[PDB]
Coordinates of all heavy atoms in Angstrom, one line a residue:
Chain B
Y14 N 27.0 94.2 93.9 CA 28.4 94.0 94.2 C 28.7 93.7 95.6 O 28.0 94.2 96.5 CB 29.2 95.3 93.8 CG 29.1 95.8 92.4 CD1 28.0 96.7 92.2 CD2 29.9 95.4 91.4 CE1 27.8 97.2 90.9 CE2 29.7 95.9 90.1 CZ 28.7 96.8 89.9 OH 28.5 97.3 88.6
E15 N 29.8 92.9 95.8 CA 30.3 92.7 97.2 C 31.5 93.8 97.3 O 32.5 93.7 96.6 CB 30.9 91.3 97.3 CG 31.7 91.0 98.5 CD 32.4 89.6 98.4 OE1 32.4 89.0 97.4 OE2 33.0 89.2 99.5
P16 N 31.3 94.7 98.2 CA 32.4 95.7 98.5 C 33.5 95.0 99.3 O 33.2 94.3 100.2 CB 31.8 96.8 99.3 CG 30.3 96.5 99.2 CD 30.1 95.1 99.0
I17 N 34.8 95.2 98.9 CA 35.9 94.8 99.6 C 36.9 95.9 99.9 O 37.4 96.6 99.0 CB 36.7 93.7 98.8 CG1 35.8 92.5 98.5 CG2 38.0 93.3 99.5 CD1 36.3 91.6 97.4
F18 N 37.1 96.2 101.2 CA 37.8 97.3 101.6 C 39.3 97.3 101.1 O 40.0 96.3 101.3 CB 37.8 97.4 103.2 CG 38.3 98.8 103.7 CD1 37.8 100.0 103.2 CD2 39.2 98.8 104.7 CE1 38.2 101.2 103.7 CE2 39.6 100.1 105.2 CZ 39.1 101.3 104.7
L19 N 39.7 98.4 100.5 CA 41.1 98.5 100.1 C 41.8 99.5 101.0 O 43.0 99.6 101.0 CB 41.2 99.0 98.6 CG 40.6 98.0 97.6 CD1 40.9 98.6 96.2 CD2 41.1 96.6 97.7
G20 N 41.0 100.2 101.8 CA 41.5 101.2 102.7 C 41.4 102.6 102.0 O 41.0 102.6 100.9
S21 N 41.7 103.6 102.8 CA 41.7 105.0 102.3 C 40.3 105.4 101.8 O 40.2 106.2 100.8 CB 42.7 105.2 101.1 OG 44.0 104.7 101.5
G22 N 39.2 104.9 102.4 CA 37.8 105.2 101.9 C 37.7 104.7 100.4 O 36.9 105.3 99.6
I23 N 38.3 103.6 100.1 CA 38.3 103.1 98.7 C 37.9 101.6 98.8 O 38.5 100.8 99.5 CB 39.6 103.2 97.9 CG1 40.0 104.7 97.8 CG2 39.5 102.7 96.5 CD1 41.3 105.0 97.1
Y24 N 36.8 101.2 98.0 CA 36.4 99.8 98.0 C 36.5 99.2 96.6 O 36.1 99.8 95.6 CB 34.9 99.7 98.5 CG 34.8 99.9 100.0 CD1 34.7 101.3 100.5 CD2 34.8 98.9 100.9 CE1 34.6 101.5 101.8 CE2 34.8 99.1 102.3 CZ 34.6 100.4 102.7 OH 34.5 100.7 104.1
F25 N 36.9 98.0 96.6 CA 36.8 97.1 95.4 C 35.4 96.6 95.4 O 34.9 96.0 96.3 CB 37.8 96.0 95.5 CG 37.9 95.2 94.2 CD1 38.8 95.6 93.2 CD2 37.1 94.1 94.0 CE1 38.9 94.9 92.0 CE2 37.3 93.4 92.8 CZ 38.2 93.8 91.8
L26 N 34.7 96.9 94.3 CA 33.3 96.4 94.0 C 33.4 95.1 93.2 O 33.6 95.2 91.9 CB 32.5 97.4 93.4 CG 32.1 98.6 94.3 CD1 31.1 99.5 93.7 CD2 31.6 98.1 95.7
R27 N 33.3 93.9 93.7 CA 33.3 92.7 93.0 C 31.9 92.2 92.7 O 31.2 91.8 93.6 CB 34.1 91.7 93.7 CG 34.3 90.4 92.9 CD 35.3 89.4 93.6 NE 34.8 89.0 94.9 CZ 35.5 88.3 95.8 NH1 36.7 88.0 95.6 NH2 34.9 88.0 97.0
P28 N 31.4 92.2 91.4 CA 30.0 91.8 91.1 C 29.8 90.3 91.4 O 30.7 89.5 91.3 CB 29.9 92.0 89.6 CG 31.3 92.1 89.1 CD 32.2 92.6 90.2
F29 N 28.6 90.0 91.9 CA 28.2 88.6 92.1 C 28.1 87.9 90.8 O 28.6 86.8 90.6 CB 26.9 88.5 92.9 CG 26.9 89.2 94.2 CD1 26.4 90.5 94.4 CD2 27.5 88.6 95.4 CE1 26.4 91.1 95.6 CE2 27.5 89.3 96.6 CZ 27.0 90.5 96.7
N30 N 27.5 88.6 89.8 CA 27.4 88.0 88.5 C 28.8 87.9 87.9 O 29.5 88.9 87.6 CB 26.5 88.8 87.6 CG 26.6 88.4 86.1 OD1 27.1 87.3 85.8 ND2 26.1 89.2 85.2
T31 N 29.1 86.7 87.6 CA 30.4 86.2 86.9 C 30.7 87.1 85.7 O 31.9 87.5 85.5 CB 30.2 84.7 86.6 OG1 29.2 84.5 85.6 CG2 29.9 83.9 87.8
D32 N 29.7 87.4 84.9 CA 30.0 88.1 83.6 C 30.0 89.7 83.7 O 29.9 90.3 82.7 CB 28.9 87.7 82.6 CG 29.1 86.2 82.2 OD1 30.3 85.9 81.8 OD2 28.2 85.5 82.2
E33 N 30.2 90.2 84.9 CA 30.3 91.7 85.0 C 31.7 92.1 85.4 O 32.5 91.4 85.9 CB 29.3 92.2 86.0 CG 27.8 92.1 85.5 CD 27.0 93.4 85.8 OE1 27.6 94.4 85.7 OE2 25.8 93.2 86.1
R34 N 32.0 93.4 85.1 CA 33.3 93.9 85.5 C 33.3 94.5 86.9 O 32.3 95.0 87.4 CB 33.9 94.9 84.4 CG 33.0 96.0 84.1 CD 33.6 96.9 83.0 NE 32.8 98.1 83.0 CZ 32.1 98.5 81.9 NH1 32.0 97.7 80.9 NH2 31.4 99.6 81.9
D35 N 34.5 94.5 87.4 CA 34.8 95.2 88.7 C 34.7 96.7 88.6 O 35.0 97.2 87.5 CB 36.2 94.7 89.1 CG 36.4 93.2 89.2 OD1 35.5 92.5 89.7 OD2 37.4 92.7 88.7
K36 N 34.3 97.3 89.7 CA 34.3 98.8 89.8 C 35.1 99.1 91.0 O 35.5 98.3 91.8 CB 32.9 99.3 90.1 CG 32.0 99.5 88.9 CD 30.7 100.2 89.4 CE 29.6 100.3 88.4 NZ 28.5 101.0 88.9
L37 N 35.3 100.4 91.2 CA 35.9 100.9 92.4 C 34.9 102.0 93.0 O 34.2 102.7 92.3 CB 37.2 101.7 92.1 CG 38.5 101.0 92.3 CD1 38.5 99.5 92.6 CD2 39.4 101.2 91.1
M38 N 34.8 102.0 94.4 CA 33.9 103.0 95.0 C 34.8 103.8 96.0 O 35.5 103.3 96.8 CB 32.8 102.3 95.8 CG 31.8 103.2 96.5 SD 30.4 102.3 97.2 CE 31.3 101.4 98.5
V39 N 34.6 105.1 95.9 CA 35.2 106.1 96.8 C 34.2 106.5 97.9 O 33.0 106.9 97.5 CB 35.7 107.3 96.0 CG1 36.3 108.4 96.9 CG2 36.8 106.9 95.1
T40 N 34.6 106.5 99.1 CA 33.7 106.8 100.2 C 34.2 108.0 101.0 O 33.5 108.6 101.9 CB 33.4 105.7 101.2 OG1 34.7 105.2 101.8 CG2 32.8 104.5 100.4
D41 N 35.4 108.4 100.7 CA 36.2 109.5 101.4 C 35.7 110.8 101.0 O 35.7 111.2 99.8 CB 37.7 109.3 101.1 CG 38.6 110.2 101.9 OD1 38.0 111.2 102.5 OD2 39.8 109.9 101.9
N42 N 35.3 111.6 101.9 CA 34.8 113.0 101.7 C 35.8 113.9 101.0 O 35.5 114.8 100.3 CB 34.2 113.6 102.9
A43 N 37.1 113.6 101.3 CA 38.2 114.4 100.8 C 38.5 114.1 99.3 O 39.5 114.5 98.8 CB 39.4 114.2 101.7
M44 N 37.7 113.2 98.7 CA 37.9 112.8 97.3 C 36.5 112.9 96.7 O 36.2 112.0 95.9 CB 38.5 111.4 97.2 CG 40.0 111.3 97.3 SD 40.5 109.6 97.1 CE 42.3 109.8 97.2
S45 N 35.7 113.9 97.0 CA 34.4 114.0 96.5 C 34.4 114.9 95.2 O 33.5 114.7 94.3 CB 33.5 114.7 97.5 OG 34.1 115.9 98.0
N46 N 35.4 115.7 95.0 CA 35.4 116.7 93.9 C 36.5 116.3 92.9 O 37.7 116.5 93.1 CB 35.7 118.1 94.4 CG 35.8 119.1 93.3 OD1 36.4 118.8 92.3 ND2 35.3 120.3 93.6
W47 N 36.1 115.7 91.8 CA 37.0 115.2 90.8 C 37.5 116.2 89.7 O 38.1 115.8 88.7 CB 36.5 113.9 90.2 CG 36.5 112.8 91.1 CD1 35.6 112.5 92.1 CD2 37.6 111.9 91.3 NE1 36.0 111.5 92.9 CE2 37.3 111.1 92.4 CE3 38.9 111.7 90.7 CZ2 38.1 110.1 92.9 CZ3 39.7 110.7 91.2 CH2 39.3 109.9 92.2
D48 N 37.3 117.5 89.9 CA 37.9 118.5 89.1 C 39.3 118.8 89.7 O 40.3 118.6 89.1 CB 37.0 119.7 89.1 CG 35.7 119.5 88.5 OD1 35.7 118.8 87.4 OD2 34.7 119.9 89.0
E49 N 39.3 119.2 91.0 CA 40.5 119.5 91.7 C 41.1 118.2 92.3 O 41.0 118.0 93.5 CB 40.3 120.5 92.9
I50 N 41.7 117.4 91.4 CA 42.4 116.2 91.8 C 43.8 116.5 92.3 O 44.7 117.0 91.6 CB 42.6 115.2 90.6 CG1 41.2 114.8 90.2 CG2 43.4 114.0 91.0 CD1 41.2 114.0 88.8
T51 N 44.1 116.3 93.6 CA 45.4 116.6 94.2 C 46.3 115.3 94.4 O 45.8 114.2 94.1 CB 45.2 117.3 95.6 OG1 44.7 116.3 96.6 CG2 44.3 118.5 95.5
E52 N 47.5 115.5 94.8 CA 48.5 114.5 95.0 C 48.0 113.4 95.9 O 48.4 112.2 95.8 CB 49.8 115.0 95.4
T53 N 47.2 113.7 96.9 CA 46.7 112.7 97.9 C 45.7 111.8 97.2 O 45.5 110.6 97.7 CB 46.2 113.3 99.2 OG1 45.7 114.6 99.0 CG2 47.3 113.4 100.2
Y54 N 45.0 112.2 96.2 CA 44.1 111.3 95.4 C 45.0 110.2 94.9 O 44.6 109.0 95.0 CB 43.5 112.0 94.2 CG 42.3 112.9 94.5 CD1 42.4 114.0 95.4 CD2 41.1 112.8 93.9 CE1 41.4 114.8 95.7 CE2 40.0 113.6 94.2 CZ 40.1 114.6 95.1 OH 39.1 115.5 95.4
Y55 N 46.2 110.5 94.3 CA 47.1 109.6 93.8 C 47.8 108.7 94.9 O 48.0 107.5 94.7 CB 48.2 110.3 93.0 CG 47.7 110.8 91.7 CD1 47.3 112.2 91.6 CD2 47.5 110.0 90.5 CE1 46.9 112.7 90.4 CE2 47.0 110.6 89.4 CZ 46.7 111.9 89.3 OH 46.2 112.4 88.1
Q56 N 48.0 109.3 96.1 CA 48.6 108.6 97.2 C 47.7 107.5 97.8 O 48.1 106.4 98.0 CB 49.1 109.6 98.2
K57 N 46.4 107.9 98.0 CA 45.5 107.0 98.5 C 45.2 105.9 97.5 O 45.1 104.7 97.9 CB 44.2 107.7 98.9 CG 44.4 108.8 100.0 CD 43.1 109.5 100.3 CE 43.2 110.4 101.5 NZ 42.0 111.3 101.7
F58 N 45.0 106.2 96.2 CA 44.7 105.2 95.2 C 45.9 104.3 95.0 O 45.7 103.0 94.9 CB 44.3 105.8 93.9 CG 42.8 106.0 93.8 CD1 42.1 107.1 94.3 CD2 42.0 105.0 93.3 CE1 40.8 107.3 94.2 CE2 40.6 105.1 93.2 CZ 40.0 106.2 93.6
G59 N 47.1 104.8 95.1 CA 48.3 104.0 95.1 C 48.2 102.9 96.1 O 48.4 101.7 95.8
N60 N 47.9 103.3 97.4 CA 47.8 102.3 98.5 C 46.7 101.3 98.2 O 46.9 100.1 98.3 CB 47.5 103.0 99.8 CG 48.6 103.9 100.2 OD1 49.7 103.8 99.8 ND2 48.2 104.9 101.0
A61 N 45.5 101.8 97.8 CA 44.4 100.9 97.5 C 44.7 99.9 96.4 O 44.4 98.7 96.5 CB 43.1 101.7 97.1
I62 N 45.4 100.3 95.3 CA 45.8 99.4 94.3 C 46.7 98.3 94.8 O 46.5 97.1 94.5 CB 46.5 100.2 93.1 CG1 45.4 101.1 92.4 CG2 47.1 99.2 92.1 CD1 44.2 100.3 92.0
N63 N 47.7 98.7 95.6 CA 48.6 97.8 96.2 C 47.9 96.7 97.0 O 48.2 95.5 96.9 CB 49.7 98.4 97.0 CG 50.8 99.1 96.2 OD1 51.2 98.5 95.2 ND2 51.3 100.2 96.6
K64 N 46.9 97.1 97.8 CA 46.2 96.2 98.6 C 45.4 95.3 97.7 O 45.3 94.0 97.9 CB 45.2 96.9 99.6 CG 44.4 96.0 100.5 CD 44.8 96.1 101.9 CE 43.6 95.9 102.8 NZ 43.9 96.3 104.3
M65 N 44.7 95.8 96.7 CA 44.0 95.1 95.7 C 44.8 94.0 95.1 O 44.4 92.9 94.9 CB 43.5 96.0 94.6 CG 42.7 95.4 93.5 SD 42.3 96.5 92.1 CE 43.9 96.5 91.2
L66 N 46.1 94.3 94.8 CA 47.0 93.3 94.3 C 47.5 92.3 95.3 O 47.6 91.1 94.9 CB 48.2 94.0 93.6 CG 47.9 94.8 92.4 CD1 49.1 95.7 92.0 CD2 47.5 93.9 91.2
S67 N 47.7 92.7 96.5 CA 48.0 91.8 97.6 C 47.0 90.8 97.8 O 47.2 89.6 98.1 CB 48.3 92.6 98.9 OG 49.2 93.6 98.8
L68 N 45.7 91.2 97.8 CA 44.6 90.4 98.0 C 44.3 89.5 96.7 O 43.6 88.5 96.8 CB 43.3 91.2 98.2 CG 43.3 92.0 99.6 CD1 42.0 92.7 99.7 CD2 43.4 90.9 100.7
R69 N 45.0 89.7 95.6 CA 44.9 88.9 94.5 C 43.5 88.9 93.9 O 43.0 87.8 93.4 CB 45.4 87.4 94.8 CG 46.9 87.2 94.7 CD 47.3 85.9 95.2 NE 47.6 85.9 96.7 CZ 47.3 85.0 97.5 NH1 46.6 83.9 97.1 NH2 47.6 85.1 98.8
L70 N 42.8 90.0 94.0 CA 41.4 90.1 93.6 C 41.2 90.2 92.1 O 40.1 89.9 91.6 CB 40.8 91.4 94.1 CG 40.7 91.5 95.6 CD1 40.2 92.8 96.1 CD2 39.9 90.3 96.1
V71 N 42.2 90.5 91.3 CA 42.1 90.7 89.9 C 42.7 89.5 89.1 O 43.8 89.1 89.4 CB 42.8 92.0 89.5 CG1 43.1 92.1 88.0 CG2 41.9 93.2 90.0
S72 N 41.9 89.0 88.2 CA 42.3 87.9 87.4 C 42.1 88.1 85.9 O 41.0 88.7 85.6 CB 41.7 86.6 87.8 OG 40.4 86.5 87.2
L73 N 43.0 87.8 85.1 CA 42.9 87.8 83.6 C 41.7 87.0 83.2 O 41.0 86.3 84.0 CB 44.2 87.3 83.0 CG 45.4 88.0 83.4 CD1 46.7 87.4 82.8 CD2 45.4 89.5 83.1
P74 N 41.3 87.1 81.9 CA 40.2 86.3 81.3 C 40.5 84.8 81.4 O 39.6 84.1 81.9 CB 40.3 86.7 79.8 CG 40.8 88.1 79.8 CD 41.8 88.1 81.0
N75 N 41.7 84.4 81.0 CA 42.1 83.0 81.1 C 42.0 82.4 82.5 O 42.4 81.3 82.7 CB 43.5 82.8 80.5 CG 44.5 83.5 81.4 OD1 44.2 84.3 82.3 ND2 45.8 83.0 81.3
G76 N 41.6 83.3 83.5 CA 41.5 82.8 84.8 C 42.9 83.0 85.6 O 42.9 82.8 86.8
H77 N 43.9 83.3 84.9 CA 45.2 83.5 85.5 C 45.1 84.7 86.5 O 44.6 85.8 86.1 CB 46.3 83.9 84.4 CG 47.5 84.5 85.0 ND1 48.6 83.7 85.4 CD2 48.0 85.7 85.1 CE1 49.6 84.5 85.9 NE2 49.2 85.7 85.7
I78 N 45.5 84.4 87.7 CA 45.5 85.5 88.7 C 46.7 86.4 88.4 O 47.8 85.9 88.1 CB 45.7 85.0 90.1 CG1 44.4 84.3 90.6 CG2 46.0 86.1 91.1 CD1 43.3 85.3 90.9
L79 N 46.4 87.7 88.4 CA 47.5 88.7 88.1 C 48.6 88.6 89.1 O 48.4 88.9 90.3 CB 46.9 90.1 88.1 CG 47.7 91.2 87.5 CD1 48.1 90.9 86.1 CD2 46.9 92.5 87.5
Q80 N 49.7 88.0 88.7 CA 50.9 87.8 89.5 C 52.0 88.8 89.1 O 52.1 89.2 88.0 CB 51.4 86.4 89.4
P81 N 52.9 89.1 90.1 CA 54.1 89.9 89.9 C 54.9 89.4 88.7 O 55.0 88.2 88.4 CB 54.9 89.7 91.2 CG 53.9 89.5 92.2 CD 52.7 88.7 91.5
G82 N 55.5 90.3 87.9 CA 56.2 90.0 86.7 C 55.3 90.3 85.5 O 55.8 90.6 84.4
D83 N 54.0 90.3 85.8 CA 53.0 90.6 84.7 C 52.9 92.1 84.5 O 53.3 92.9 85.4 CB 51.6 90.0 85.1 CG 51.6 88.5 85.2 OD1 52.5 87.9 84.6 OD2 50.6 88.0 85.8
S84 N 52.4 92.5 83.4 CA 52.2 93.9 83.0 C 50.9 94.0 82.4 O 50.3 93.0 81.9 CB 53.3 94.4 82.1 OG 53.3 93.7 80.9
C85 N 50.3 95.2 82.3 CA 48.9 95.3 81.8 C 48.4 96.7 81.7 O 49.0 97.6 82.2 CB 48.0 94.5 82.7 SG 47.7 95.2 84.3
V86 N 47.2 96.8 81.1 CA 46.4 98.1 81.2 C 45.0 97.7 81.6 O 44.3 97.0 80.9 CB 46.3 98.8 79.8 CG1 45.3 100.0 79.9 CG2 47.7 99.3 79.4
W87 N 44.7 98.1 82.9 CA 43.5 97.7 83.5 C 42.7 98.9 83.8 O 43.2 99.9 84.2 CB 43.8 96.9 84.8 CG 42.6 96.4 85.7 CD1 42.0 95.2 85.5 CD2 42.0 97.0 86.8 NE1 41.0 95.1 86.5 CE2 41.0 96.2 87.3 CE3 42.2 98.3 87.4 CZ2 40.2 96.5 88.4 CZ3 41.4 98.6 88.5 CH2 40.4 97.7 89.0
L88 N 41.4 98.9 83.5 CA 40.5 100.0 83.7 C 39.3 99.7 84.5 O 38.8 98.6 84.5 CB 39.9 100.4 82.4 CG 40.6 100.7 81.1 CD1 41.3 99.5 80.5 CD2 39.4 101.1 80.2
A89 N 38.7 100.7 85.2 CA 37.5 100.6 86.0 C 36.8 101.9 86.3 O 37.5 102.9 86.4 CB 37.8 99.8 87.4
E90 N 35.5 101.9 86.3 CA 34.8 103.1 86.7 C 35.0 103.3 88.2 O 35.1 102.3 89.0 CB 33.3 102.9 86.4 CG 32.9 102.6 85.0 CD 31.4 102.6 84.8 OE1 30.7 103.1 85.7 OE2 30.9 102.2 83.8
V91 N 35.2 104.5 88.6 CA 35.2 104.9 90.0 C 33.8 105.6 90.2 O 33.5 106.6 89.6 CB 36.4 105.9 90.3 CG1 36.3 106.4 91.7 CG2 37.7 105.2 90.0
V92 N 33.0 105.0 91.1 CA 31.8 105.6 91.4 C 31.7 106.0 92.9 O 32.6 105.6 93.7 CB 30.6 104.6 91.2 CG1 30.5 104.2 89.7 CG2 30.6 103.4 92.1
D93 N 30.8 106.9 93.3 CA 30.5 107.2 94.7 C 29.5 106.2 95.3 O 29.1 105.2 94.7 CB 30.1 108.6 94.9 CG 28.7 108.9 94.2 OD1 28.0 108.0 93.9 OD2 28.4 110.1 94.0
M94 N 29.1 106.5 96.5 CA 28.2 105.6 97.3 C 26.8 105.5 96.7 O 26.1 104.6 97.0 CB 28.2 106.0 98.8 CG 29.4 105.6 99.6 SD 29.3 106.1 101.3 CE 29.6 107.8 101.2
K95 N 26.5 106.5 95.9 CA 25.2 106.5 95.2 C 25.3 105.9 93.8 O 24.4 106.0 93.0 CB 24.5 107.9 95.2
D96 N 26.5 105.3 93.5 CA 26.8 104.7 92.2 C 26.8 105.7 91.1 O 26.5 105.4 89.9 CB 25.8 103.6 91.9 CG 26.4 102.5 90.9 OD1 27.6 102.4 90.9 OD2 25.6 101.9 90.2
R97 N 27.3 106.9 91.3 CA 27.5 107.9 90.3 C 28.9 108.0 89.8 O 29.9 108.1 90.6 CB 27.0 109.3 90.8 CG 25.5 109.3 91.0 CD 25.1 110.6 91.6 NE 25.8 110.8 92.9 CZ 25.4 111.7 93.8 NH1 24.5 112.6 93.5 NH2 26.1 111.8 95.0
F98 N 29.1 107.9 88.5 CA 30.4 108.0 87.8 C 31.2 109.2 88.3 O 30.7 110.3 88.2 CB 30.2 108.1 86.3 CG 31.5 108.1 85.6 CD1 32.2 107.0 85.3 CD2 32.0 109.3 85.1 CE1 33.4 107.0 84.6 CE2 33.2 109.4 84.4 CZ 33.9 108.2 84.1
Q99 N 32.4 109.0 88.8 CA 33.3 110.0 89.2 C 34.3 110.2 88.1 O 34.4 111.3 87.5 CB 34.0 109.8 90.5 CG 33.0 109.6 91.7 CD 32.1 110.9 91.8 OE1 30.9 110.8 91.5 NE2 32.7 112.0 92.2
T100 N 35.0 109.1 87.8 CA 36.1 109.1 86.8 C 36.4 107.7 86.4 O 35.9 106.8 87.1 CB 37.4 109.8 87.4 OG1 38.4 109.8 86.4 CG2 37.9 108.9 88.5
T101 N 37.1 107.5 85.3 CA 37.6 106.2 84.9 C 39.0 106.1 85.4 O 39.8 107.0 85.1 CB 37.4 106.0 83.4 OG1 36.1 105.9 83.1 CG2 38.2 104.7 83.0
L102 N 39.3 105.0 86.1 CA 40.7 104.8 86.5 C 41.4 103.9 85.5 O 40.9 102.9 85.1 CB 40.7 104.1 87.9 CG 42.0 103.9 88.7 CD1 42.6 102.6 88.4 CD2 43.0 105.1 88.4
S103 N 42.6 104.4 85.0 CA 43.4 103.6 84.1 C 44.6 103.2 85.0 O 45.3 104.1 85.6 CB 43.9 104.4 82.9 OG 45.1 103.9 82.3

Side-chain angles (χ1 to χ4, degrees), chain B residues 14-41 43-48 50-51 53-55 57-79 81-94 96-103:
Chain B
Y14 306 90
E15 173 192 7
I17 300 163
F18 194 49
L19 298 185
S21 308
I23 302 179
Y24 291 83
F25 191 89
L26 290 187
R27 185 176 61 190
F29 301 99
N30 172 17
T31 62
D32 292 310
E33 293 225 33
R34 57 182 191 249
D35 304 316
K36 279 182 184 183
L37 261 7
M38 183 175 66
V39 176
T40 62
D41 188 342
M44 279 182 176
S45 52
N46 177 322
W47 287 86
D48 297 316
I50 297 169
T51 71
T53 29
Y54 284 57
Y55 291 98
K57 302 176 166 168
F58 268 89
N60 299 334
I62 293 306
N63 283 322
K64 181 113 147 192
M65 179 184 81
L66 290 169
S67 304
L68 289 183
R69 276 172 271 141
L70 295 179
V71 162
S72 80
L73 306 176
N75 69 340
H77 167 85
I78 288 286
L79 194 56
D83 296 341
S84 61
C85 70
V86 174
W87 182 87
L88 306 63
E90 302 184 13
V91 174
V92 301
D93 62 18
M94 286 181 284
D96 206 29
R97 294 172 298 191
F98 181 80
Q99 297 306 109
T100 182
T101 289
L102 189 266
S103 156

